[model samples]
Target chain A: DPLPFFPPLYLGGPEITTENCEREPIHIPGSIQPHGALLTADGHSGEVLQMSLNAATFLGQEPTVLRGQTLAALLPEQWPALQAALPPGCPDALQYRATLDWPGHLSLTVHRVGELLILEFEPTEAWDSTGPHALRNAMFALESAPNLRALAEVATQTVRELTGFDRVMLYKFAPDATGEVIAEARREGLHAFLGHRFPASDIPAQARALYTRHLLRLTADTRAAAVPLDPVLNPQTNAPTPLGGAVLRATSPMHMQYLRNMGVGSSLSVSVVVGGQLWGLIACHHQTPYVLPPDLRTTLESLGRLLSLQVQVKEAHHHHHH
Target chain B: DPLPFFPPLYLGGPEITTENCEREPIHIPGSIQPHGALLTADGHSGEVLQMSLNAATFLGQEPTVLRGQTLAALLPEQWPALQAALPPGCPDALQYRATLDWPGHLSLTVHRVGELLILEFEPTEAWDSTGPHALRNAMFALESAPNLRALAEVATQTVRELTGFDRVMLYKFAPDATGEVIAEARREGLHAFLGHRFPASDIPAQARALYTRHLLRLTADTRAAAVPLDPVLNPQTNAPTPLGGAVLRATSPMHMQYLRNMGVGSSLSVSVVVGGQLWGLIACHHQTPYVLPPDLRTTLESLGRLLSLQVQVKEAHHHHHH
Candidate 1:
């Protein structure tokens, strides 16, 4: 249930683990995804305390101009909904769908942390009810796999089909935090990462934690220029805002560099949670900017979650046979 | 929990919260309580990785001399039990009771994060099987409190009696992260911190998290010289060990200084968690070091948890009538 019994079947090199890379605070970076945006406001005052650098780009205003504005000012139409969705305080992070414009909509998640309300927005496209249907099919395919490795193979293929990424991989984390490509499906002959092992330094603990909490992480176009937030400190506390819950949180520069080195122009990784802990990831990569419709993205997330329990069941069977 | 809850918190001085005392890494200073010892080990190798500076004083062996030693090397008789207590991987923190030849007894707790297994040890003394009984009495007393403020007043007294510190204050946190001593019980004329409101900079984000998860934090003697861990980084990852889970984690020099400035020799604070958020702290301070008996410590922790829930009922009346 907690993934393969320990003494993690380590299969990586010396460069895989490094404390420097592991400790980076990848969550609070000043920028965010170009395709989406994020806003953090004072939970009580509803005044904008901070936002992603890409925020003003969406609002059609200068980043500094938006700093002291209230949430009602930014999304006057959705303010009531946002308020109604909020809990008495920060105990739970909640998400809701909102339409900012007639043709534009977003998936908004909010959580209170002390006096600040962290608000995350990711684009949401209209869709059919395809999540459960796609996931049900993926589960059947996964259940037939004979072992953990085989189940991982099916999960990757299923995710690749659902996401349409140029490449898909089942990246299993080892005891050392290093990961191995147990299964992969790549566009013919570009490269095969299957069986290749990478060091733990690739995804710092902070990034990994974000993955476990949220279902999917995407970089629609890594080549796009990065954006940085303005006036980084909270005006109230005058301290830097903590953004561990942002969906559009910025990618670590180190990670951006690593992705560039690997020639992955776009990427989406979905966390595979097992026994209520992060077991591994379904890493999808593309050579060009690739996007998944929101419904499809949800489908893949459902598949990954279904496979989490399925893998545990199948892995136990494999263990019993052995 | 521990962090100063920065965004919502406003210090007396508008500018003090940014990168000030609130941002200090209060954990991992490589020193520990004069009252007890603590150690960190490689979960895989079981070799000592880090020990508090005062660890040497407790074991009669230099911290450097004991750095690479195994649990068996330190306490041969109890090694089997310690091994038995550990789970295969770092899923959750674990605690147990032990009797050592030199130090009559101890309460041991272990948790794993990455490659390190954090071990915390606090002294225990013989006690009657009266904890459950005492807790029942405290629960009854808590239930009788008329309102939230009354509950806070009773809680400070209940905790003060159970823990025997010089001053016990119901330190309720404000929405802004500033905390005030709403109610107090003390060893007469202890300079009345009662009604005193302090800045949020007193607790930073990370410290709040650890104290929240563990529920209690102690600084047996802050004036005791600080200790630094030798060989700061783990050899394998070349990263400083993550010690967020350590019990005798060293005080941030900033915090140590703050405590000294306040003329406190020792302090212990147990979190009052309400609705899954840190409501405030039962701040216990002493002019001289005050140590709680482990049995009574666990007993008090139980009573606190119950009162944390109990105060909610009392709080509704406080809110409805206030």
Candidate 2:
């Protein structure tokens, strides 16, 4: 399926993270463990502003050399696609994925300095080229589910099958900022988190704000550390690299602890955003580390969007019957 | 002639203000000498969140008391129209002008503070019942201006005439944020800021920001003391009241000082917005303190909208000619 609906790259800016930057009592450290590569480049000067610590391995260059070179010198083949994907003047978040003459396909996330277009590179982990079409076939059944609960049931079950997770739960948020586990599909013998309730405190306000804007988040291996951006300051501003719109944004350590405490080895949470707020999430968990491919992740994102829309659809369908 | 447009009250959120909150070298201070009354109320609940320092006088009650009451309690007769003028949910701004039981007519500005609707009420300085038609006549001439230069000239001349300000200047911003006077209408013998360019630094970034969101801003006197909000936070979170949408958002003291430096006693400016950025401003200045009543302010806002649309029109026409 085509990645059809990202907002204009410059459509959003820094006030978001800053305004909602409050942190909770839980140790929500700003850093993520190393697992991917990130690079920030000036839009006008065409020089790199910063890079992830693992940039050397991803781009096969010295950290010092990669810091100042333009994207053209870094990944010459992808530069054209990168240039095309660049926002007209400023940057917003846009994701593009492709196979390269390497071990795995990489996905790139572009952010405007919040002018510097920060590009993130991450391996797709595993690939199934037919992932989109397969998920599309599964969605046919999802669309056929008649009401919200029924719809959610199909969604959870289908996503579990699509991603092969141990448990897939359709968890929804309520007005009071609390959450309810409305439906679930899980591997047999797994302890179910279904029909459970979580306090708003579980997801800090800032995380909720981030979740509203960011739809799908996957912890490929909860056990492995995520990568950190290198040279942290934006060269132009000499300030911390703004990470408001970057996908593959490192999950907070506090959240990682929450998942671990629940015995989840790895997890992927897809948002069901409606009218621009997080109404619910389709959360998948595995008993062990799992790598979700870019194609599969893309399908889940598309599915999340469909479910968000279908939520409204199912409400009308159920409401009309009364 | 008709302000058939206003950006929706919630067209954006904090990300917008924070990201673009860059300040130039010139001081654009955070304080405004509020010259009018201010009130913020939840749209659905009608519960007041915060009231300006002077709201008690305008509403004839202690603000401590007004904070919990709806706008209906303060101005019962006009509540219906006010309620109707409220865009159902997180829609952009909606303004309404009507007479209150006391001192002067009131005009309101609406902006949604996340889910809580914030409404601002200000006492229109003075009134001319025939003001609407009078300005409408001028607008007909404004519409007839043949080119952008002509349009700017018409805009300045007519606004100066309608508001009776001693001088009116049309200033457009360059890519670098510097602005030039495209047209001027002023009393003879006034020192001309006409055709003169001012660096972007003069207004400062935050001042430029408020202009982009709030199309019109007025100061009856450069030296008069305006009001401040009491208990400064939204009652909901004990957080700073989201006053981004307030009309009486105080003018930067630095801006007041700048006006003083210009020998202006009072001023009003209407934004010439084009393609979602500040194209220019229809700035009016008077040597003596002058109040533009709500009806007149309403007309000027209408004129600003027309000029905004006409900016597109003139550019299209220029495009066609080429």
Candidate 3:
């Protein structure tokens, strides 16, 4: 029961090596189509290689482009973009899905290990029909769960399936103020983030307060330069004005630096409020910059609010019952 | 021009000695009958002694009765009922028109010294109606003053004339939060309490805040045990429950203790609020228990509020002028 079985061959690919499987088994039955890969560099000669893959197209080209290639040599012009996307001061993963000229209709995700960017790519049309629906349905099922642990289990499955991302997790904040990834859904051949604890210092009190007001925060295109808002003519009004061609950027420099240092390219979080306080966040990691439109962002926020309400209701019911 | 001129002969008593005139003198027109002696006290000891006399009918066999003798012992107990009732706590110099107990009625006023209380009685069909009126009129005149200093001067004169209380002072609170007697109106032979400073700790923040809310808080019988209100049948609605009733006793204990320790048997304070914050109080003190009925208490409160508003307006005008 620990590993649910539904789609067996869907999990098989050239990236299914012994190294990744031993780290954490990828649950392919739950993942979405157009899946990506992440690679890490081996330290000695500074050689980067594809570390894991979720589809066959990425597995097919791994032998030629990944093996023995310094990541800089592989994508020289894209290096700065990669550097900006990854968390500062640390090697991490990123997410990018695009039709590359070199490889037709491909999507790639890469992670830096030591000095090299390890990358993996796949054809963009692999899981077109079934993946997204499966994720949405799984999330719906999890909402009905009676306890937090059960809910976390469902969360793990849904996130992993939706993004085809490695090491999906359900991180929960404690009353005394600390966060831990309690339940994880990982690619069968990748390491899991479950049981990892992050310090309270990572998300200070002021940041937690912000989460109460905002439903979802996403970082897409981490490499994009930040643009500031021009002073408005009327200072009294709090109305949101059109950007007027200015590029949108991440709000906090410190947060950007922290993410880069953690070796993550982009992240998406949905806040959880319990007992009038920020309980935790549903966080997703990608090894490349993500580019989601306003509609998608709105949809995610709505879903997050629904989830938070359900969680609050269940907690209240539990307290009443006890 | 600094002092008013008066008649050559004392009118009320026969024992109007040269010593009494040397001690206390009044310059009044010969047409008006001299009423009584105006005596001064040893401010530190709360004592009272005769300083000057007017005529013979005012003198009694035991003119120099030491401390603790009732007013009835000197002239007659019924004499106060005949006088144009002086305001509560006005020492020395009472008034009288006519009464059944003593057809030739008399009014006496007493002022306390360190260990002495001065006694002065005047025989008259028409009592001195000008003193209280004059004091009230002076306060009204200051309604046009431009600042607290000018207003304070008026306050000192008013309290002195109305109470006949020696060393009437206008105590103002410092920005550093200390209180000092800044202005004074003392009888000719009386000692002054001016320029005396009280520690800031004497009135703490909580007391000041309460003073702002109450406007006028008085303690007529500080040592009298507060009587408790009877419990209502429904335990909900009872307005004027006894003094020590649960509701009344709930006020800050620190304030109660403070008044008690200051030897203030009775006190009346007016609040001063500037810039929406509590500024300080205009406090009046008596060494003996002094009570005013509800109507009089209300009048005092109205006057206090008027003074406070006046101070605020003056300060604002001063600031604007500067």
Candidate models: Cα lDDT each: 0.64, 0.63, 0.45
Which digits, one per residue and each the tens of the lDDT, describe model 2 over residues A193-224? Answer: 78889887676666667677566677766767
Minimum summed lDDT over a 10-residue window in model 1 chain A is located at A1-10
Residue lDDT tens for model 1, A135-185 = 423434664576677777777777777667789988888878899999998
lDDT of 3 by residue, B1-322 (tens): 1122122233242332432322112212111112333332232232332233223334443334532234444335433442323334432212222222243545443332223233334443433222111212333355445567878778667655555443446667887778888777765765566788997666654455445434545545566543211121111222211111011122233444676896566665556555446665556666666643322333344344445545655565455445
Off by over 4 Å in 1: A1-322, B1-19, B53-56, B60-67, B72-77, B88-93, B103-107, B121-130, B316-322
Model 1 interface DockQ: 0.01
Worst 10 residues of 3 chain A by lDDT: A240-249
Worst 10 residues of 3 chain B by lDDT: B239-248
TM-score, B chain alone, candidates in order: 0.80, 0.81, 0.47
Interface RMSD of each: 24.4, 26.5, 37.8
| Deviation in Å, model 3, residue B69 alpha carbon | 99
Model 1 - which docking category? incorrect
Q: In model 2, which regions exceed 4 Å deviation?
A: A1-32, A89-91, A103-113, A124-127, A319-322, B1-322
**lDDT, model 3, position B97:** 24
- Give the docking tier of candidate 2: incorrect
